[PDB]
């Protein structure tokens with residue numbers, strides 16, 4: 001609410017938006033209380049530290065004036081992680097938890113895999129930094145590595161960065177540059193991406209092998225962790241020994 | 248067409264994969280809302296992200312791997328028009344790892360598995 005009712009990058013206070021006062025004051029108070037409650041109640045454990053520590057600084061103006069850049073740099077981080085870490089609450093519903101298990105299993109697999117394939121992209125990134133140096137997408141080695149990482153999705157920019165330069169004699173190394181473009185297209189948009197589809201299809205088919213057990217295992221582990229934590233008199237008040245159904 | 252011998256199985260497969268994506272969408276609407284509200288801050292002064300609903304549609308269109316990288320990150324950066332330059336690029340690699348690569352391959356995983 002405190003995002004979508006304020007233009008990003010404008011400073012704000014309870015006293016208003018610098019060019020909704022009750023809304024802004026109450027949403028800031030709720031975020032500040034939710035942050036301090038968070039610290040009291042305190043990768044799941046890491047995300048909660050990021051949200052509370054950063055969610056303070058987005059709402060810090062109510063007490064200490066902070067540059068509008070920090071107010072909304074912290075806000076960009078906090079708002080992102082608030083919704084990402086909401087997925088870890090959705091694991092506690094039967095119709096959501098299996099998808100979020102599949103999403104964590106494929107993420108872990110890609111994060112284990114990318115220690116190898118950073119060097120695969122570093123080779124092409126340092127290579128196109130030489131071959132294409134006089135072009136803005138590749139002006140610097142880090143920009144060239146990001147450009148190569150963007151090309152993994154199959155958007156090569158082939159007409160804008162090879163052929164249009166070549167038909168103007170702007171490519172310093174013309175035959176070597178095309179020869180590297182065909183071999184990049186083979187290794188990265190085809191071979192690496194199909195290896196990640198191969199892993200992802202293989203591993204999700206193994207989660208789906210017991211998914212129907214895994215739902216119920218997650219439910220019993222949820223309920224039993226609550227049954228360990230709730231007070232014994234409450235379980236005795238709440239737990240009837242039998243129930244009727246009327247189909 | 249479901250009542251013809253040589254059509255009905257494809258429409259049964261269309262039904263199974265559509266239901267599977269719709270059951271998954273309740274979880275992944277919050278995955279795109281994270282990036283959509285994030286890029287609404289990081290790239291607010293660009294027309295694709297002028298409003299939070301436009302930024303969520305833009306992120307949804309980016310799932311197909313058309314990131315608009317030169318048009319919305321690099322060409323602005325080489326003119327100093329990015330308010331948060333380091334944080335904005337760092338979120339662009341993260342979006343690609345979590346949405347065009349992971350989320351789309353998770354759907355190919357489900358789709359292959361069900362057919």
Ligand SMILES: COc1ccc(OC)c(NC(=O)c2nnn(Cc3ccc(Br)cc3F)c2N)c1
Pocket residue numbers: 127176178179180181183184
């Ligand atoms: C593990 O590494 C392996 C494994 C199997 C391999 O062979 C298929 C290779 N070789 C190549 O990838 C390669 N061979 N030729 N080219 C063309 C070329 C190279 C440098 C420049 Br600059 C411009 C060019 F046109 C390549 N990209 C490497």
Ligand SMILES: COc1ccc(OC)c(NC(=O)c2nnn(Cc3ccc(Br)cc3F)c2N)c1
Pocket residue numbers: 043076077080084085087088285334336337338341342345
């Ligand atoms: C379920 O949620 C999970 C599960 C596993 C996770 O990590 C392995 C995470 N973490 C991230 O996605 C993340 N961590 N760092 N960054 C970089 C970054 C963040 C915000 C901004 Br704004 C700019 C940035 F560069 C991310 N995108 C969340």
